[PDB]
Each structure stands twice: as structure tokens, then as C-alpha cells.
Design a binder for this molecule. Structure first.
Ligand code: CLA
Ligand code: CLA
Ligand code: CLA
Ligand code: CLA
Ligand SMILES: CCCCCCCCCCCCCCCC(=O)OC[C@H](COP(=O)(O)OC[C@@H](O)CO)OC(=O)CCCCCCCCCCCCCCC
Ligand SMILES: CC1=C(/C=C/C(C)=C/C=C/C(C)=C/C=C/C=C(C)/C=C/C=C(C)/C=C/C2=C(C)CCCC2(C)C)C(C)(C)CCC1
Ligand SMILES: CC1=C(/C=C/C(C)=C/C=C/C(C)=C/C=C/C=C(C)/C=C/C=C(C)/C=C/C2=C(C)CCCC2(C)C)C(C)(C)CCC1
Lengths: 122, 56
């Protein structure tokens, strides 16, 4: 386990925790208990933007972009209730956290695309 | 003196200055190629190779 001084300036602060390859197990859900997500983290690796179609009205594709706003992109420290439904399904209801980041990516040719990368009210 | 249309004849028996004049001409042409490419890049729209290619 790492401290702030271990992490500061390395770029690790913008990465989500990972689990090892051995973690292919199963987490029992007891429909009688209440559950919560204590920490949700989302770490983007790729931003794709849909090209504004020439006018062929054919398939407009999502194309690669270059991140220009650095390691400032991740959503983290997100919490909320994890409901167990009648049908045995789970529903995560986001309540609070660092659940948005402004992000600017750049398309080939220079066009900059700002977006509010978010999961607000997920 | 020399008429205006003969000024460059001073180079005929001066190989070093002829090389200089040729160097200058070469500099101008290469400078044109560079400038022309820049102007084209500043005006070229790469967004539609189908109906808006370079030759349009
Ligand atoms: C490749 C081009 C080139 C080269 C290497 C030379 C080289 C030479 N010239 Mg020649 N000349 C040229 C083109 C060139 N000239 C042109 C286009 C004209 C008509 C203006 C002349 C008229 C000329 C005269 C009257 C004389 C020479 C002479 C000479 C010699 C001495 C330098 C000199 O006095 O230049 C003078 C020439 C210039 C200063 C060129 C004029 C510059 C023009 C206007 C362009 C400048 C570029 C500008 C920044 C861009 C404008 C952009 C616009 C859209 C606003 C040397 C052998 C001398 C010589 O030895 O006589 C025996 C001499 O008396 N030249
Ligand atoms: C590689 C090509 C080349 C070269 C190196 C020369 C070199 C020469 N020429 Mg020849 N000539 C050429 C091709 C060439 N010529 C072509 C294609 C024609 C027909 C158009 C001629 C017709 C011709 C005549 C009738 C004469 C020469 C003369 C001369 C000599 C003096 C030039 C001078 O002082 O002008 C000085 C020029 C100026 C001060 C201004 C000229 C301005 C021009 C007309 C307009 C602007 C031109 C622009 C800047 C150039 C753009 C580049 C172009 C290729 C697109 C010199 C040995 C003279 C000579 O024999 O002297 C004894 C002479 O009387 N030339
Ligand atoms: C080693 C033998 C050799 C080599 C490799 C060359 C090569 C060249 N000559 Mg020739 N020449 C030679 C022997 C040689 N020459 C001899 C023994 C004579 C009698 C003195 C001449 C008389 C002669 C005349 C009158 C002219 C040439 C010109 C040229 C150039 C025309 C193409 C050009 O400018 O491209 C564009 C250039 C490049 C893409 C850059 C090339 C990079 C250079 C070579 C590096 C420069 C550093 C180098 C150490 C110093 C000069 C090398 C010198 C041997 C050429 C080219 C560089 C013409 C010229 O210079 O035009 C501007 C020209 O007017 N030559
Ligand atoms: C194969 C390619 C090629 C060849 C053979 C030449 C040959 C020549 N160039 Mg170069 N040039 C080239 C490519 C070439 N050019 C390219 C790609 C560029 C970048 C655009 C240039 C830019 C350039 C400049 C800036 C100059 C030259 C000049 C010259 C002349 C120098 C020798 C001289 O004293 O002539 C004496 C001149 C003549 C014999 C008259 C040539 C007449 C041409 C062919 C047509 C003129 C059109 C019209 C009457 C005037 C232009 C219209 C106006 C509205 C602008 C010679 C005719 C120099 C020169 O002309 O100095 C006086 C000069 O200043 N050239
Ligand atoms: C891109 C950069 C470009 C910059 C280049 C600069 C371009 C310079 C262009 C120079 C052009 C100058 C012309 C010199 C003009 C000039 O000096 O003429 C007189 C000149 C006389 O020369 P001589 O051998 O007698 O020597 C006298 C010396 O003092 C000349 O230097 O003869 C010529 O030059 C031959 C060309 C005949 C031209 C005759 C045409 C005139 C007749 C009238 C036509 C119009 C009326 C028509 C009615 C229908
Ligand atoms: C020195 C130096 C430098 C720089 C350089 C430069 C910046 C350049 C340039 C340049 C240039 C930028 C140039 C140019 C040019 C141009 C030209 C040469 C042109 C021309 C033209 C013409 C000739 C035309 C004609 C005509 C007309 C006008 C109209 C119609 C018809 C005709 C087409 C005939 C460096 C840093 C590298 C380094 C070393 C030193
Ligand atoms: C060593 C040294 C030095 C040097 C210098 C030099 C070498 C310079 C130069 C220079 C130069 C050599 C320049 C130039 C120029 C130029 C020009 C002035 C031009 C032009 C042009 C034009 C105008 C163009 C146009 C165009 C074209 C042609 C095509 C496309 C379109 C356009 C329109 C864009 C000094 C003193 C700093 C000091 C220290 C040392």
C-alpha cells in the first residue's frame, strides 16, 4: 500500500485500483441484506469522437483522438446504494463523488473537442 | 554601360559569381516550394477525399 508521497507526480493518482489475475471468483449476494458501492472508479483509456458525416448519410465512424488535458480524466471516490431487485438484478444508484471531469481531446487536423466526461446521477 | 537586358552577362567570365547566382536562384525556387506548401496547408480542407479532394 502506497502513501501520497509515493504517488505524487507519477500519474498513478489518475489510475483506478486493479485486481490480480487470480481474482476470477464470485461475490455472494444475500437478498435480505442492504448493499452499497463504497468506491467506484472509472479510468478512461480511449476517447473516440463521431466524425460529422460528409453528406453521404452513410456510416459515420468513431475516430481516435489525442488527449491534450493530461492525466486529469478519471472519475473516482463515487459511492451509492446497490439495490437488490425482485428479479434478482442489482441496481446501482449513484449518490455522490468526483463524478465528472472536463476533458479536451483533439481530432486529426486540430479540431478540439471539449466534453464533460461524467456519470452524474448514474 | 550595359543595357538593362544584359546586366547578368557580368557572370559569363566569373565562375564563382555564376555559382552564387545559381545558388540564389536555387534558394528562391526552394523557398517558393516551401512557401507554396505552407499556403496550401493553411487553406486545404482534408475532411472529404471523396467530394472535396485536393484537385477541387
Ligand atoms: C534569381 C534572381 C536574380 C539573381 C540571382 C540576380 C543577380 C544579379 N543581378 Mg539581377 N535582376 C533580377 C533577378 C536576379 N538578379 C530581377 C527580377 C531584375 C529586375 C528588377 C533584376 C535586375 C538587375 C539590375 C538592374 C542589376 C542586376 C544586377 C545583378 C548582380 C548583382 C546584384 C544586383 O544588383 O541585383 C539587383 C536586383 C534586385 C535587387 C532584384 C529586384 C528585387 C525584386 C523587386 C524582388 C524582391 C523580393 C521582394 C522582397 C518580394 C516582393 C513581394 C511583393 C508581393 C510585394 C547579380 C549577378 C546588377 C549587375 O551586376 O549589373 C551589371 C545590376 O545592375 N539585376
Ligand atoms: C535557364 C534559362 C535562361 C538563362 C539562365 C538565361 C540567361 C541570359 N539571358 Mg536568355 N532567354 C531565356 C532563357 C534564359 N536566359 C528564355 C526562356 C528566353 C525567351 C523568353 C530568353 C531570351 C533572351 C533574350 C532576348 C536575351 C536574353 C539574354 C540573357 C543574358 C542576360 C540576362 C539579363 O541580364 O536579363 C536581365 C533581366 C531583367 C533585368 C528583368 C527581366 C524581367 C522579365 C522579362 C519579367 C519578370 C521575370 C520573372 C522575375 C521571372 C520568373 C521566372 C520564370 C521562369 C517563370 C543571360 C546570359 C540577353 C543577352 O543575350 O545578353 C547578351 C538577351 O538579350 N535571353
Ligand atoms: C565533386 C565533384 C562535383 C560535385 C559533387 C558537383 C555537384 C554540383 N554541381 Mg558541379 N562542378 C565541378 C564538380 C562537381 N559538381 C567541377 C570540378 C567544376 C568546375 C569548377 C564544376 C562547375 C559547376 C558550376 C559552374 C555549377 C556547378 C553546380 C553543381 C550543383 C548543381 C545541382 C544543385 O545545385 O543541387 C541543389 C543543391 C543541393 C540539393 C545541396 C547539395 C549539397 C552540397 C553539395 C553540399 C555543400 C557542401 C560542400 C562541401 C561544398 C560544395 C561541394 C562542391 C563539390 C559542389 C551540384 C551540387 C551548380 C550549382 O552550384 O548550382 C547552385 C553550378 O552553377 N558545378
Ligand atoms: C525549369 C524551371 C525553371 C527555369 C529553366 C528557370 C529559368 C530562369 N529563372 Mg527561375 N523559377 C522557377 C523555375 C525555373 N526558372 C520556379 C519554379 C520559381 C519559383 C516561382 C522560379 C523563380 C524565379 C525568380 C524570382 C527569378 C527567376 C529567374 C530566372 C531566369 C534567370 C536567368 C536570366 O537572367 O533570365 C533573364 C530573363 C528572361 C530571359 C525572361 C524570362 C521570361 C519568362 C520565361 C516568362 C516571363 C513572363 C512575363 C513576361 C512576366 C511575368 C508576369 C508578371 C505579371 C509577373 C531564367 C529565365 C530570374 C530572372 O528572370 O531575372 C531577371 C528571377 O528573378 N526564377
Ligand atoms: C516576380 C518579379 C518580377 C520583377 C521583374 C521586373 C520586370 C521589369 C520589366 C522590364 C521591361 C522594360 C522594357 C524596356 C524597354 C526599353 O528599354 O526599350 C528600349 C531598348 C533600347 O535598348 P538599347 O540597346 O538601345 O540600349 C539602351 C539602354 O539604355 C537600355 O538599357 O530596347 C529594348 O529593351 C528591347 C525591348 C523593346 C520594347 C519595345 C516595346 C515598347 C513599344 C510600346 C508598346 C506599348 C504600346 C503598344 C500600343 C499598341
Ligand atoms: C536565411 C536563413 C533561414 C531562413 C530562410 C527563409 C525564411 C526562407 C525563405 C524563403 C522564401 C519564403 C521564399 C520565397 C520565394 C518566392 C518566390 C521566388 C516566388 C516567386 C514568384 C514568381 C516568379 C511569380 C510569378 C508569376 C506571377 C506573380 C503572377 C502570374 C504569372 C507568374 C507565375 C509568372 C534559416 C532559418 C533556415 C536558416 C539559415 C538562414
Ligand atoms: C547569421 C545571422 C543573421 C542572419 C540572417 C539571415 C541569414 C537572414 C535572412 C533572411 C531571409 C533570407 C529572409 C527572407 C525572406 C523572404 C521573403 C520576404 C519572402 C517572401 C515571400 C513570399 C511573399 C511568398 C508568397 C507566397 C508564395 C510564393 C507561394 C504561396 C503563396 C504566398 C502568397 C504565401 C542575423 C542578422 C539575424 C544576426 C545574427 C547572425
Amino acid at each position: 500500500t502506497l502513501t501520497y508521497d509515493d504517488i505524487v507526480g507519477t500519474g498513478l493518482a489518475n489510475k483506478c485500483p486493479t485486481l490480480d489475475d487470480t481474482a476470477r471468483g464470485a461475490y455472494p449476494i444475500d437478498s435480505s441484506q442492504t448493499y452499497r458501492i463504497a468506491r467506484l472508479c472509472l479510468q478512461p483509456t480511449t476517447f473516440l469522437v463521431k466524425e460529422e458525416p460528409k453528406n453521404k448519410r452513410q456510416e459515420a465512424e468513431f475516430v481516435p483522438t489525442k488527449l491534450v488535458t493530461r492525466e486529469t480524466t478519471s472519475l473516482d471516490q463515487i459511492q451509492g446504494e446497490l439495490k437488490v431487485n425482485s428479479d434478482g438484478s442489482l441496481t446501482f444508484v449513484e449518490e455522490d463523488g468526483i463524478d465528472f471531469q472536463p476533458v479536451t481531446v483533439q481530432m486529426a487536423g486540430g479540431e478540439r473537442i471539449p466534453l464533460l466526461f461524467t456519470v452524474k446521477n448514474l | 554601360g550595359l543595357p538593362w537586358y544584359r546586366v547578368h552577362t557580368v557572370l559569363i567570365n566569373d565562375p564563382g559569381r555564376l555559382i552564387a547566382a545559381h545558388l540564389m536562384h536555387t534558394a528562391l525556387v526552394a523557398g517558393w516550394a516551401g512557401s507554396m506548401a505552407l499556403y496550401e496547408l493553411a487553406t486545404f480542407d482534408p475532411s472529404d477525399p471523396v467530394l472535396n479532394p485536393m484537385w477541387r
